Amino acid sequence: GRLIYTAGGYFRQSLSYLEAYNPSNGSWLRLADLQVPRSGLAGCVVGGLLYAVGGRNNSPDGNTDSSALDCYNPMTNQWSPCASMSVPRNRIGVGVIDGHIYAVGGSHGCIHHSSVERYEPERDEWHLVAPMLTRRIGVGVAVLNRLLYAVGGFDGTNRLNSAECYYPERNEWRMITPMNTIRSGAGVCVLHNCIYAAGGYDGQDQLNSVERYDVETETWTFVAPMRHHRSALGITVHQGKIYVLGGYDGHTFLDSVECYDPDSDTWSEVTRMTSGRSGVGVAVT
Numbered sequence: 507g508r509l510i511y512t513a514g515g516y517f518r519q520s521l522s523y524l525e526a527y528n529p530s531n532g533s534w535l536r537l538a539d540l541q542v543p544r545s546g547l548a549g550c551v552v553g554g555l556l557y558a559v560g561g562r563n564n565s566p567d568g569n570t571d572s573s574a575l576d577c578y579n580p581m582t583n584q585w586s587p588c589a590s591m592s593v594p595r596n597r598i599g600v601g602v603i604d605g606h607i608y609a610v611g612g613s614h615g616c617i618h619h620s621s622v623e624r625y626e627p628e629r630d631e632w633h634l635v636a637p638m639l640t641r642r643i644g645v646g647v648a649v650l651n652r653l654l655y656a657v658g659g660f661d662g663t664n665r666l667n668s669a670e671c672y673y674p675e676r677n678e679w680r681m682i683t684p685m686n687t688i689r690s691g692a693g694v695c696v697l698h699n700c701i702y703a704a705g706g707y708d709g710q711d712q713l714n715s716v717e718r719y720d721v722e723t724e725t726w727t728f729v730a731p732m733r734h735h736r737s738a739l740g741i742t743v744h745q746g747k748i749y750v751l752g753g754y755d756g757h758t759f760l761d762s763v764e765c766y767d768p769d770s771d772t773w774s775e776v777t778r779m780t781s782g783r784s785g786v787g788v789a790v791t
């Protein structure tokens with residue numbers, strides 16, 4: 507019984523929620539709030555612990571990007587601080603390879619990072635690795651075949667359809683085939699050996715479209731679109747289906763969670779979050 511955990515997010519201000527969804531019975535758990543509110547974070551899991559990485563606290567008193575790494579233990583229902591990153595990273599992307607967390611891109615005020623750093627939980631230390639070829643905020647990250655892909659985003663001037671691949675053993679990045687569509691703030695994940703990029707913002711509108719990358723054919727193909735157009739959506743994969751959570755549709759902050767079934771190539775409404783929000787961090791344990 508693994509749960510879908512959603513941390514933080516934004517509606518009127520950054521949020522402190524930690525909620526978990528159990529797909530096998532439809533139930534939502536209300537778990538311990540984050541110590542500091544944050545939106546534009548990413549979530550991931552190492553060792554059955556949930557990590558909240560980066561983001562920003564957009565509050566009525568003002569706006570502060572986060573270099574924070576916090577760790578939630580589902581056994582104790584408690585958040586514990588970890589070593590902070592080298593730099594704050596709002597609108598960050600994250601991936602895990604061999605039990606190490608990669609923090610990719612993101613912003614600190616006006617600085618759009620190309621830099622990438624790696625956390626080792628066993629030593630509680632971050633270290634920089636080779637930077638990306640492109641500065642990317644609002645970037646999606648997927649891990650596939652022990653390689654890390656950085657997909658789309660915004661480089662400070664252009665919104666991106668480009669994507670790139672990081673080779674940990676070699677410590678190098680290479681550009682891959684660009685997507686069909688410019689996307690920042692998309693949900694990017696891996697399912698059944700393909701990278702999926704769902705939604706985002708193309709410079710003009712929120713998107714419902716979804717495309718997937720086949721690493722051997724080197725081509726992106728559109729699949730069924732989502733039921734809602736969404737940017738700043740959370741994403742994860744649970745039992746062979748993609749789950750997308752919240753986001754901003756151009757007018758409203760959505761509470762909709764939808765599910766992609768790769769067998770039928772369809773999306774379905776599965777549940778609603780307790781309140782609409784965007785810019786959450788999501789992970790499954």
Ligand SMILES: CCOc1ccc(S(=O)(=O)Nc2cc(CC(C)=O)c(NS(=O)(=O)c3ccc(OCC)cc3)c3ccccc23)cc1
Binds near residue numbers: 515738754
């Ligand atoms: C009226 C819409 O207001 C908001 C306010 C805050 C958020 S948020 O979720 O807390 N912040 C973020 C904000 C944004 C930009 C905003 C303010 O929408 C991100 N990037 S983005 O969605 O690529 C995006 C969306 C729309 C844009 O044009 C005008 C509204 C530009 C870029 C994000 C990408 C990933 C994660 C978080 C993002 C999202 C929307």
